[PDB]
Amino acid sequence: GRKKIQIQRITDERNRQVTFTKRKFGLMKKAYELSVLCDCEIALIIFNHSNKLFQYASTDMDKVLLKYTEYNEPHESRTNADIIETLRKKGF
Amino acid sequence: GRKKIQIQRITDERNRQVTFTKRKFGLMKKAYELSVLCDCEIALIIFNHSNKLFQYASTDMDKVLLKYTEYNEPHESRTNADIIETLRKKG
């Protein structure tokens, strides 16, 4: 971007909405690429700060949610804290 | 990257797994940033080619799924085909 920003809450209502819209699309674009390159089925659910709902699924949201509910094994499961942990460990 | 690639299925099992791991993390990192910058709650569910499950949620997957079920109003809903269409338009 024209200037580097720190990862922290945006206070200006207007900047927040603008950044939300652009980054949401950027997230969905990256999901699209992953699903095609690597043959994945992906669903994304986003609630904004007012709790409005936006959703993406590579093909069909219902099917992925149904598969999620059926899944029995333990699996990789991450939160913000896992991501932050990974970044403290990475050098790049 | 060193080269532009076409967005099409990677057949080399090894290249696929390397790409999968790096891009999955890239997706979760961008989710993390969006959730903090714009004060929102995000969940991501991924089934790989072997049907193994990977999941991310900014705070709590249960709560997002519970909230999802309670939503009834119409909302933005996109698929790969919408994204492809958008990219046609962007040029």
Binding site: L65, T69 | L66, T69
Partner: peptide, 16 residues
């Protein structure tokens, strides 16, 4: 995912 009451709530929403 495996078991639960959330699993139940999600399944029903999807099925109705």
């Amino acid at each position: 995912w495996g078991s639960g009451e959330v699993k139940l709530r999600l399944q029903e929403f999807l099925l109705s």
